[PDB]
């Protein structure tokens, strides 16, 4: 037949994995990345998806779509939608109560339902899998946050159908993470697991109680507007200030300068999770001025201190609601690309009085990993 795949669809990135010969392989895309941006772009001549889309965002703000996960399954009159709209550089219109994204493709203006944008990303993932597997992918298990209602889940299932994917099942992201680590095996005991998920733009904390294979979400908390992007922003402002100090030039207005500076920062941030310092080299940032500088892990940590620290409040809240003390949680798994940050790992352990963190599986691949296993058994 055909190997069912596991797909995680995140607000900023997506990932696809497959279970074969007892091992789960996370499939790398055309650029060789193990995760693909959830970006879709429309130009005069083409429809760009993934890395190709994100790589040209500075040029096409109005026709480059993202955050479709924040729209999916919702209405236009939805307070959330009404708030989010204020920050997207693309158009969201009302179509009989449902929101739609309006872009210009090949001179003509077009509109898409949130699920159609997601189906585009889903198609890229399916494509990546097939290119690797050398076979056509039909069956799949897609992940969704635990707090998604039936409409949001419906729309995700739909986005899968559009892409020609037979969605075997939609499972929660935290549950997929648990399965990745094997925290679902029956041990004739009640296990309390805390899933700490800090991705690109969202922060989710979920306390699961696993009784004989059966998962039970006891509490959830977090911030839908706190993620790795907020950390990048802090770097940007910092460097803008420095440029204005060394050159007496404010580049805030120049959207190209800022958007290129941001890309440089996000990159330096990743290397800061291994090295203690990274350099920023950008040619002709503003006018013909080349911006050559660098940051240390120490400085980076200072810039996001309050943010990193504030991460513990949602954790305290989740425990409180679940009616558990720090000592009652058996396993803590790290999920989301942002958890690779050292200071975040330290901060969490200290809170759990030195308890060991589960983090051998790349945190941004954990959900995909778990869905792959789940997909495997489902076939
Ligand atoms: N080494 C690293 N250090 C810090 N952040 C990293 C590292 N590697 C990846 N990231 C960050 O992880 C984020 C992507 O996380 P992930 O791939 O889990 O996102 P996601 O599921 O789309 O997230 P969400 O749904 O929360 O937005 C980006 O902010 C990226 O900068
Ligand atoms: Mg994620």
Quick one: three-class SS letters along 167-184? Answer: EEEEEEHHHHHHHHHCCC
Q: How many CA atoms lie within 13 A of 29 on its CB side?
A: 22
Helix axes 173-181, 366-377, angle to 10 degrees: 80
Report the distance separating Cα 206 and Cα 149, nearest Å. 16
Q: What residue's CA is closest to ligand 1, atom 10?
A: 337
Q: Say which residue the tokens 């095996």 belong to.
A: 185
Q: What residue's CA is closest to ligand 1, atom 8?
A: 337
Chain-centroid distance, C-alpha 180 = 17
- Nearest ligand to the C-alpha atom of residue 36: 1
Whether the Cβ atoms of residue 197 and residue 173 lie closer than 8 Å to each other: yes
In this structure, what token pair is assigned to residue 295?
A: 């940051």
Helices (H), 85-209: 114-133, 150-162, 173-181
Q: Is 340 annotated as a binding residue?
A: yes
- Nearest ligand to the C-alpha atom of residue 10: 1
Whether the Cβ atoms of residue 45 and residue 347 lie closer than 8 Å to each other: no
Whether the Cβ atoms of residue 264 and residue 251 lie closer than 8 Å to each other: no
- Nearest ligand to the C-alpha atom of residue 342: 1
Q: Is 6 annotated as a binding residue?
A: no
Residue from 267, 270, 272 nearest 282 by CA: 267
Q: Say which residue the tokens 């429309």 belong to.
A: 42
* Domain residue ranges of the chain, discontinuous segments joined by +: 2-65+121-185+359-379, 66-120, 186-226+311-358, 227-310
Q: State the CB neighbour count (10 A cutoff) for residue 325.
A: 9
* Nearest atom, ligand 1, residue 198 CA: 26
* Nearest atom, ligand 1, residue 8 CA: 21
Report the distance separating Cα 131 and Cα 259, nearest Å. 32
DSSP string, 50-69: THHHHTTTTT-GGGEE--GG
In this structure, what token pair is assigned to residue 95?
A: 């179509």
* Nearest atom, ligand 1, residue 69 CA: 25
- Torsion angle, alpha carbons of 277, 283, 284, 290, to 10: 50
Q: Is 10 annotated as a binding residue?
A: yes
Q: Which of left, alpha, beta for 178 (phi over 0: left; psi -120 to 50: alpha)?
A: alpha
Q: Is 267 annotated as a binding residue?
A: yes
* Nearest atom, ligand 1, residue 274 CA: 1
Whether the Cβ atoms of residue 9 and residue 118 lie closer than 8 Å to each other: yes
Report the distance separating Cα 209 and Cα 194, nearest Å. 9
Cα dist. 358→14, 354, 369 in Å? 21, 13, 14
Highest CATH level, class, for 186-226+311-358: alpha beta
- Phi, psi dihedrals of residue 109, rounded to the nearest 5°: -85, 135
- C-alpha Rg value of the chain to the nearest Å: 21
- Torsion angle, alpha carbons of 27, 29, 34, 36, to 10: -120
> Resolution of this PDB entry, in A?
2.2
Which superfamily, per CATH, for 227-310? ATPase, substrate binding domain, subdomain 4 (3.90.640.10)
Chain-centroid distance, C-alpha 285 = 28
Report the distance separating Cα 360 and Cα 367, nearest Å. 13
CB within 6 Å of ligand 1 — which residues?
10-13, 35, 199-202, 227-229, 266, 269-270, 273, 336-338, 340-341, 364
Residue from 253, 222, 190, 189 nearest 338 by CA: 222
Highest CATH level, class, for 66-120: alpha beta
Fold: same for 2-65+121-185+359-379 and 186-226+311-358: yes
Long-range contacts of 215-218 (CB under 8 A, 24+ apart): 215/172, 215/175, 215/178, 215/184, 217/146, 217/172, 217/174, 217/175, 218/192, 218/321, 218/322, 218/323, 218/324
- Phi, psi dihedrals of residue 112, rounded to the nearest 5°: -130, 145
Report the distance separating Cα 57 and Cα 338, nearest Å. 22
Q: What residue's CA is closest to ligand 1, atom 11?
A: 337
Report the distance separating Cα 124 and Cα 108, nearest Å. 24
Q: Is 64 annotated as a binding residue?
A: no
* Nearest atom, ligand 1, residue 363 CA: 18
- Nearest ligand to the C-alpha atom of residue 265: 1
Q: What residue's CA is closest to ligand 1, atom 12?
A: 337
CA of 124 to the centre of ligand 2 (A): 17
Q: Is 255 annotated as a binding residue?
A: no
Neighbouring-strand partners of residue 332 = 194
* Structural domain 2-65+121-185+359-379, CATH architecture: 2-Layer Sandwich (3.30)
In this structure, what token pair is assigned to residue 171?
A: 């499972």
């Amino acid at each position: 037949k055909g190997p069912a795949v596991g797909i995680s669809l995140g607000t900023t990135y997506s990932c696809v994995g497959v279970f074969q010969h007892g091992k789960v392989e996370i499939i790398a895309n055309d650029q060789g990345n193990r995760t693909t941006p959830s970006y879709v772009a429309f130009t005069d001549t083409e429809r760009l998806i993934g890395d190709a889309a994100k790589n040209q965002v500075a040029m096409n703000p109005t026709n480059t779509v993202f955050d479709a996960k924040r729209l999916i399954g919702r209405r236009f009159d939805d307070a959330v939608v009404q708030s989010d709209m204020k920050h997207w550089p693309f158009m969201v219109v009302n179509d009989a109560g449902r929101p739609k994204v309006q872009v210009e493709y090949k001179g003509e203006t077009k509109s898409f339902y949130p699920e159609e944008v997601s189906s585009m990303v889903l198609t890229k993932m399916k494509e990546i899998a097939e290119a690797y597997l050398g076979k056509t992918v039909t069956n799949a298990v897609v992940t969704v946050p635990a707090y998604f209602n039936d409409s949001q889940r419906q729309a995700t299932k739909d986005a899968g159908t559009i892409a020609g994917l037979n969605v075997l099942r939609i499972i929660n992201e935290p549950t997929a993470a648990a399965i990745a680590y094997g925290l679902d095996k029956k041990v004739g005991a009640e296990r309390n697991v805390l899933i700490f998920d800090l991705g690109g733009g969202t922060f989710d904390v979920s306390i699961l109680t696993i009784e004989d294979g059966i998962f039970e979400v006891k509490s959830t908390a977090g911030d839908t507007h706190l993620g790795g992007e907020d950390f990048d922003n802090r770097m940007v402002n910092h460097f803008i200030a420095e440029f204005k100090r060394k050159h007496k030039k404010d580049i805030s207005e120049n959207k190209r300068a800022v958007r290129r500076l941001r890309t440089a920062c996000e990159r330096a941030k990743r290397t800061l999770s291994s090295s203690t310092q990274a350099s920023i080299e950008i040619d002709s940032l503003y006018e013909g001025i080349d911006f050559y500088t660098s940051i240390t892990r120490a400085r980076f940590e200072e810039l996001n201190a309050d943010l990193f620290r504030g991460t513990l409040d949602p954790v305290e809240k989740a425990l409180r609601d679940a009616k558990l003390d720090k000592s009652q949680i058996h396993d803590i798994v790290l999920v989301g690309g942002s958890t690779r940050i050292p200071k975040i790992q330290k901060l969490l352990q200290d809170f759990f009085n030195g308890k060991e963190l589960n983090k051998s599986i790349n945190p941004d691949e954990a959900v995909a990993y778990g869905a792959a296993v789940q997909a495997a058994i489902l076939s």
